[PDB]
């Protein structure tokens, strides 16, 4: 018999993104080629099957630095990190291939699905 | 020119609640009278003006244990902690006064607003 506040989840995500932009309580650096991205482990786990597997591992859960596969494009990662914290995906003709490949690697099934749909249309 | 995934914020919050239920990456214990509640600092900050103030403080941001004011009722806190992680508020005749008082202390303005509306109706 609960009541529900419709905007609560969106407002929580917006505040988590504000913490990220101000580098507050970020507890991991994701290294993609030369590029470094600071984030919250919990948000990464909540969005990605790959980060979920990494941070539930008894040894890896304690690492402050995670290095991604050298094939991963920093721009593709950046677009996906922004999606994790906002629900908004900057999908463009020039980045769609790098975004799909990064989403497949990160195990973000809904992003993979929209990328496949957009590629099929063109 | 982004696209948006409608269910993303709700799905993120659902996964954060799954991490909480399994005690994964929880980094703080909130003590309310005898009762202890494990949580994620970032989620507490995203939902509460009080926890936002506490964990942005250069000294308090590093505490693993936070003790609330002895006037705070553990059940009222538990109902509010569940709301933070789910968007669902278990508001009942027998708990509404304790929920409103706890929400005022935690600075959760939307919960305070619905409590005042429900009290006014009765």
């Amino acid at each position: 018999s609960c009541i529900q506040f419709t905007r609560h989840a969106s407002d929580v995500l917006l505040n988590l993104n504000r913490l990220r932009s101000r580098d507050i309580l970020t507890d991991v650096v994701i290294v993609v080629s030369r590029e470094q991205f600071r984030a919250h482990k919990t948000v990464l786990m909540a969005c990605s099957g790959l980060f979920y597997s990494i941070f539930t591992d008894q040894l890896k859960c304690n690492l402050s630095v995670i290095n991604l596969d050298p094939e991963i494009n920093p721009e593709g990662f950046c677009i996906l990190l922004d999606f994790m914290y906002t629900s908004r995906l900057n999908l463009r003709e020039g980045n769609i291939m790098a975004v799909m490949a990064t989403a497949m690697y990160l195990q973000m099934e809904h992003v993979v699905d929209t990328c496949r749909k957009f590629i099929k249309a063109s | 020119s982004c696209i948006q995934f409608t269910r993303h914020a709700s799905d993120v919050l659902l996964n954060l609640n799954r991490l909480r239920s399994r005690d994964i990456l929880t980094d703080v214990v909130i003590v309310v009278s005898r009762e202890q509640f494990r949580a994620h600092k970032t989620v507490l900050m995203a939902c509460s003006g009080l926890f936002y103030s506490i964990f942005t403080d250069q000294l308090k941001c590093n505490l693993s244990v936070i003790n609330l004011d002895p006037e705070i009722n553990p059940e009222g806190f538990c109902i509010l902690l569940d709301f933070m992680y789910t968007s669902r508020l278990n508001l009942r005749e027998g708990n509404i006064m304790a929920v409103m008082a706890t929400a005022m202390y935690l600075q959760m303005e939307h919960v305070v607003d619905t409590c005042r509306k429900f009290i006014k109706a009765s």
Partner: peptide, 4 residues
């Protein structure tokens, strides 16, 4: 607020 809604009835979920």
């Amino acid at each position: 607020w809604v009835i979920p």
